[PDB]
Ligand binder design. Structure first.
Ligand SMILES: [Mn+2]
Ligand SMILES: [Mn+2]
Ligand SMILES: [Mn+2]
Ligand SMILES: [Mn+2]
Ligand SMILES: [Mn+2]
Lengths: 116, 115
DNA sequence: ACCACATGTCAACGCGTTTACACTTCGG
DNA sequence: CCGAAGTGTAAACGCGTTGACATGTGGT
């Protein structure tokens, strides 16, 4: 299963969900909150869960049960490949000269600093 | 703020800005590059409304190349939108040392492709 | 028991796309 | 001139969202 064949037709919402899960696996409403933080608005759970269900059916997300009212969503191996593939495309178009590159380098350096 | 523009746009539109972040191009050149990305035919009836909409949002400038050809380029605002989305994806991808070194090798390979 | 939490589900609604027809412009 | 290039554009159409109802769980 190639993640490219399955992840280039996803909507911005779905791709943002995968990026959130790229940080760490999360239960439903925790994803909602982090999406809400990115969008600056409220995200309707009636939109989240069906989109999580779609990503599951596409093979990009696994749905496990923490307790029998809570599910934990996480990226499959194909899901992580989808996140990597999207980043390699974004970068291949952004890294157009040396200034663009070092900009990315300081971004990644600052990100690694926040992790300590 | 760069976030407020980037968040709303659709995937199709951000792909337009990613394309333009590499280089300013004319309409059908954007079309062909997205057709290579999607691996599907891209309807021009879909592209031109989207580029124009991105102009009304102040993220793309529409200039005259010929009087049958337009050149589309990123405004400084559109660039900040591209950079902000890049920063968010990276902020959530660089979760440990291996993730960072993965991004470093990608960026290094990209830089070596420049010549 | 109480009442959050967590997720399920849907159809009226919103909205962008598809699929056309259409124009003016440049090359040979 | 004649065809392709390049872009314009609108209505049927497809298709995901909105905003709500809904169930069942876990905590206190
Ligand atoms: Mn979606
Ligand atoms: Mn909600
Ligand atoms: Mn990709
Ligand atoms: Mn093509
Ligand atoms: Mn076309």
């Amino acid at each position: 299963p190639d993640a490219r064949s399955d992840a280039r037709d996803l909507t911005a919402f779905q791709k943002n969900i995968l990026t959130v899960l790229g940080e760490e696996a999360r239960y439903g409403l925790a994803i909602k909150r982090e999406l809400e933080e990115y969008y600056g608005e409220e995200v309707n759970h009636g939109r989240l869960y069906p989109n999580l269900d779609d990503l599951v059916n596409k093979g990009l997300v696994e749905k496990s049960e923490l307790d029998k009212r809570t599910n934990e969503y996480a990226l499959t191996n194909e899901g992580f490949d989808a996140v990597v593939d999207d980043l390699e495309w974004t970068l291949s178009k952004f890294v157009a000269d040396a200034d663009r590159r070092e900009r990315v380098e300081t971004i990644v350096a600052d990100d690694a600093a926040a992790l300590e």
